[PDB]
Design a protein around this ligand. Structure first.
Ligand SMILES: Nc1ncnc2c1ncn2[C@@H]1O[C@H](COP(=O)(O)OP(=O)(O)OP(=O)(O)O)[C@@H](O)[C@H]1O
Ligand SMILES: [Mg+2]
Length: 839
């Protein structure tokens, strides 16, 4: 029974008042009651404890006496030193408690029955009446076996769900899933032990298998809140990893997973194994959670008792710190960039183990070397997470040859079509049918990935002919000090990056954390040239001004469309080797670490560097092919490109910036120093329809300045200059306040201003416009600096002075007034303050 429905009929309103929180709550409780959720009246933690006692006793076929129960409570269930983290761990891992009764016998007491879900007892309660007058806080808590695992916060129809989210006894530490609703929109998100919380962007709507949203509370309840559905989401489709972070799977992920599982069961039952028709593939756009989903799918696949072994296969190219840190718990030291099959062979012979994590390289090697493995004759499941074409063909040939009974499943954001095939077989031919799909279109619609802002930066007349070169032969022949690597070109590019880095990364505003960036270059010589030029120029600027703060720059490359670079550094030539050695030397000098250039030390360098780019310890990372595919860094907002990128390689490269973070990150920045427009549009069109480019790619500076109309619902979006104009006209401060109507309009309009400027900071033209506002005067000398740096003609310079912007003081006044109106509203339904932007 799929918990993500292929077909669902939208439920009809009752006709009764749906306006207030009490209405939503009343109909919610009634609905749940009709779905098998018993409503118990429980007004206290003592009552809760009594109920938990009864439900656990019933579940485990056991009986506590007051002393025994008090002990179980104090030691396991309710111990005071337990936090949210401890309860989450207890639910997902430690849920079995070995308990010694007073008569000294030992029994295993389950909090949840994970093998049979429907045996678990589900109930609902409502909020406690507390004390003197504050209120409202209308909530409904879903208890599993007495444990308060789910919390639904309710708001009235008018309230914007986003602001409601922004607004926010030991047993409630057990809360796993949160749900929030105004009844029009219902959004769920995981409970967290963080010390830095997630944002609204991570909250998810429930949906059907075609990814179409399910919004209103009635349908959310009729679908997501079905006991089978809900309990599956809590138990099977929630992830508690080695980072001890709770991740609730988005609907498309669950759909893909359960469709794979059903596919395996059906293929086994029919003895249809070892064909493409016994397998499947999953198309999930880059950045949509393929790793999490595929891995969870493998894990669940091990729970099929007819399946002997489950391979989870990844590319070393797609590896980073957290992933390798995670896989350690399953197949220790068997997952790395080496060619060694020893760890893999040890995993194969490991008792009480099904799951086997490995790399496509190691798997291919094993299949070549070993003729008759026992596992060849077993019941096998292969789960491939984004495995590039490099070793994949050969590995597939050997796989088809040696493995007798198998079900193989692909996971990719960029399937192999005939169009982009390039020597490789189509995904469809390899894996057979497509079990599920979540396209870049749906992903942008659901705001689970970021759009692209792609610009070819053309300030360089001398090299423009080269950067725009279509011919592939000329392109290939142009990499050298004569054409592409020309010192002037490299110098200009580097200088641009140095000048605009803080702008593109949102480090502009004073006291802003911001983001970091990557630089994808064409070759090893390109990496050398760029690193050297960056060093030189940063030194020069440091000598010019004492206040200048340098950007920490690292680089990584190996021997080696994106060419796979191995982890063996012996394959490199002496010059590249020397440069890498020096770079790693400086990396060591600054970060006070010791990394050698031998394969092990270089792998350590890879991992540590990954972690340091992820946490922003490194400002700019220069790579050739590395960290362009599977690398996950939510705080990386910009990809600088001087490289030839086509199709799948282009999508994967650009997608390093696509991860959602918060309102501060509007989209990914792709700044290209060769013209990628045709390549971009071709790629996007291949992975979507003809219209996909009008979704994925951001709008123009002119559009955001003067306003534009969105194709989807026809919503006319006001321009930045219109917002400014109306701010000056209708509210030139402080006297627009105190009145409440004017307060509301000001909040709305200035909200639009904030979002608009936040979007506009990524545009070079806006950067130029804002830079023009110092200057002065004259002092020319002050003009030629600005013009040469911002690449501005006398004509353009003359025009830019016509443009009239509010003073910094007026903007700060608006921001403080905004802050005060925000602080005033604690003690207006549809209004949403921008919380992240004010931070
Ligand atoms: N259900 C979820 N809840 C919260 N966060 C999620 C969820 N699924 C994915 N993420 C986050 O989204 C980011 C991308 O996930 P992941 O690395 O699996 O993407 P991917 O599609 O495998 O990567 P790529 O396509 O770039 O190789 C990660 O930082 C992950 O924590
Ligand atoms: Mg992945």
């Amino acid at each position: 029974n799929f918990i993500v429905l292929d077909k669902y009929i939208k439920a009809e309103p009752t006709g009764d008042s749906y306006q207030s929180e009490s209405d939503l709550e009343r109909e919610l409780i009634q609905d749940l009651r009709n779905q098998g959720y018993e409503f118990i009246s429980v007004k206290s933690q003592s009552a809760m404890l009594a109920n938990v006692r009864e439900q656990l006793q019933n579940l485990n076929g056991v009986v506590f006496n007051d002393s025994e129960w008090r002990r179980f409570t104090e030691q396991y269930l309710d111990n005071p030193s337990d936090g949210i983290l401890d309860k989450t761990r207890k639910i997902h891992i430690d849920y079995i408690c070995d308990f010694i009764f007073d008569d000294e016998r030992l029994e295993n007491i389950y909090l949840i029955d994970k093998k049979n879900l429907m045996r678990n007892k589900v109930q609902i309660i409502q909020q406690f009446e507390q004390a003197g007058s504050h209120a409202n806080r209308y909530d409904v808590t879903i208890l599993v076996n007495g444990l308060p695992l789910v919390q639904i916060e309710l708001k009235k129809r008018g309230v914007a769900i986003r602001e409601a989210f922004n607004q926010i006894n030991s047993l409630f530490k057990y809360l796993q899933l949160f749900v929030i609703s105004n009844g029009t929109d219902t959004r769920y998100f995981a409970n967290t032990t963080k010390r830095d919380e997630n944002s609204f962007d991570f909250t998810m709507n429930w949906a059907k298998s075609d990814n179409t949203l399910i919004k209103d509370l009635k349908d959310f309840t009729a679908t997501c809140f079905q006991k089978h559905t809900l309990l599956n989401v809590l138990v099977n489709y929630s992830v508690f990893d080695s980072s001890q972070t709770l991740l609730v799977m988005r609907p498309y992920q669950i759909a893909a997973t359960e469709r794979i599982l059903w596919k395996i069961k059906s293929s086994f039952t029919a003895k249809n194994w070892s064909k493409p028709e016994s397998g499947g593939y999953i198309w999930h756009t880059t950045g949509s959670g393929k790793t999490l989903t595929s891995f969870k799918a493998a894990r669940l696949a091990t729970e099929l008792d007819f399946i002997d072994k489950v391979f989870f296969v990844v590319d070393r190219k797609d590896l980073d710190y957290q992933t390798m840190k995670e896989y350690q718990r399953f197949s220790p030291d068997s997952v790395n960039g080496s060619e060694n099959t020893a760890g893999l062979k040890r995993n194969l012979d490991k008792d009480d183990n099904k799951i086997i994590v490995t790399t496509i390289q190691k798997l291919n090697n094993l299949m070549k070397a070993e003729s008759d493995l026992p596992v060849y004759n077993q019941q096998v499941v292969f789960i491939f997470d984004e495995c590039h074409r490099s070793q994949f063909g050969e590995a597939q040939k050997n796989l088809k040859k040696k493995f007798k009974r198998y079900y193989q499943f692909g996971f990719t954001g960029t399937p192999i079509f005939p169009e982009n095939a390039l020597g490789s077989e189509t995904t469809a031919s390899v894996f057979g049918r497509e079990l599920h799909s979540y396209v870049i279109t749906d992903a942008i619609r659901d705001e689970k990935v970021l759009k692209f802002k792609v610009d070819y930066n053309d300030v360089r007349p001398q090299f423009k002919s080269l950067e725009t070169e279509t011919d592939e032969k000329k392109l290939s022949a142009a990499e050298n000090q004569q054409a592409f690597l020309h010192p002037m070109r490299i110098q200009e590019i580097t200088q641009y990056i140095l000048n605009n880095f803080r702008q593109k990364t949102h480090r502009t505003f004073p006291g802003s954390k911001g983001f970091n960036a990557m630089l994808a270059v064409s070759s090893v010589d390109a990496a050398k040239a760029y690193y050297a030029t960056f060093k030189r120029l940063q030194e020069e600027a440091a000598n010019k001004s004492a206040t200048y703060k340098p950007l920490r720059i690292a680089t990584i490359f190996s021997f080696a469309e994106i060419s796979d670079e191995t982890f063996d550094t012996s394959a490199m030539d002496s010059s590249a080797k020397e440069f890498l050695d020096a770079a790693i030397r400086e990396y060591n000098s600054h970060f006070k670490t010791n990394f050698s250039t031998d394969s092990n030390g270089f792998q350590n360098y890879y991992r540590d560097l990954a972690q340091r780019v992820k946490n922003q310890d490194i400002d700019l990372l220069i790579v050739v092919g590395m960290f362009l595919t599977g690398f996950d860094a939510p705080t990386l907002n910009t990809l600088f490109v001087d490289k030839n990128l086509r199709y799948h390689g282009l999508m994967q490269a650009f997608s390093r910036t696509n991860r959602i973070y918060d309102a501060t990150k509007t989209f990914g920045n792709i700044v290209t120093f060769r013209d990628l427009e045709r390549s971009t549009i071709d790629a996007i069109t291949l992975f979507g329809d003809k219209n996909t480019k009008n979704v994925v790619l951001e709008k123009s500076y002119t559009e955001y300045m003067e306003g534009f109309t969105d194709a989807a619902t026809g919503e006319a979006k006001r321009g930045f200059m219109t917002v400014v104009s109306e701010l000056e006209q209708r509210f030139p401060d402080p006297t627009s306040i105190e009145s409440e109507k004017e307060k509301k309009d000001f909040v709305k309009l200035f909200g639009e201003y904030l979002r608009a400027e936040n979007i506009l900071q990524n545009y070079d033209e806006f950067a130029t416009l804002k830079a023009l506002q110092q200057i002065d005067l004259s002092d020319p000398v002050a003009v030629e600096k600005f013009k040469a740096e911002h690449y501005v003609d006398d004509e353009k310079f003359a025009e830019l002075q016509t443009i009239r912007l509010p003073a910094d003081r007026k903007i700060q006044d608006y921001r403080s007034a905004y802050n005060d109106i925000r602080d005033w509203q604690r003690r207006w339904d549809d209004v949403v303050f921008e919380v992240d932007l004010l931070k």
